Design a protein around this ligand. Sequence first.
Ligand code: NA
Length: 104
Amino acid sequence: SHMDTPSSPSIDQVEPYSSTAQVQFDEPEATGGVPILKYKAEWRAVGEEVWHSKWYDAKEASMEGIVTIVGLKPETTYAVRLAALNGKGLGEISAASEFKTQPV
Ligand code: NA
């Protein structure tokens, strides 16, 4: 009788530059029963406790196949994960993917 939140997106690869990175991902296998509305990316520098997060429109993300994370520091290793938002709320977070920003 009730829809749930989406299953997890999958991160394929991350293409990092100096202060930004392109996160390549797959849509959830299951929407949960109602449509994906937004994506949330969360990232943090490995070793640190604080997570940074940003919302992304579902339409452009799923069409481009990417979300772009910003405000990164050069030469630094990060963990990133993704979750889909539907009408019920936030779904399962993806497995974390680790990348390193390039040197300036
Ligand atoms: Na894939």
